């Protein structure tokens, strides 16, 4: 995400980037949504009492 | 449903911002692309919303 706008001019370029893009984003959400549920589904259950 | 109305958008706001540059456009850099083609009005309203 650091990179921004891509200076290409391209059609065949273009359209790669554009699905490119939106493989990211999905993996990124995907990635910071199960460190979520790690994170929440821990801290909870122990039993040697 | 909602993946097709998000994805229709983006072109929907793409050729609403169209119409401006047909009718009201600024004193814009003199031929530069900023006088935009459908490819351009595509393009900056998909890459703001990635």
């Given at each position: 995400q650091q990179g921004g706008e891509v200076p290409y001019t391209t059609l065949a370029t273009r359209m790669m980037m554009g699905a490119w893009w939106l493989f990211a984003l999905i993996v990124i959400s995907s990635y910071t949504a199960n460190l979520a549920a790690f994170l929440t589904i821990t801290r909870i259950e122990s039993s040697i009492q | 449903s909602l993946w097709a109305c998000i994805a229709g958008t983006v072109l929907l706001v793409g050729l609403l911002v169209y119409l401006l540059n047909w009718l009201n456009p600024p004193?814009?850099?003199?031929?530069?692309?900023?006088?935009?083609t459908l490819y351009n009005s595509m393009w900056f309203v998909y890459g703001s919303f990635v």
């Amino acid at each position: 995400q650091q990179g921004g706008e891509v200076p290409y001019t391209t059609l065949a370029t273009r359209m790669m980037m554009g699905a490119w893009w939106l493989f990211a984003l999905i993996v990124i959400s995907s990635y910071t949504a199960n460190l979520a549920a790690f994170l929440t589904i821990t801290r909870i259950e122990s039993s040697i009492q | 449903s909602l993946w097709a109305c998000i994805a229709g958008t983006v072109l929907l706001v793409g050729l609403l911002v169209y119409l401006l540059n047909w009718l009201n456009p600024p004193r814009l850099q003199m031929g530069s692309m900023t006088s935009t083609t459908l490819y351009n009005s595509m393009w900056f309203v998909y890459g703001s919303f990635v």
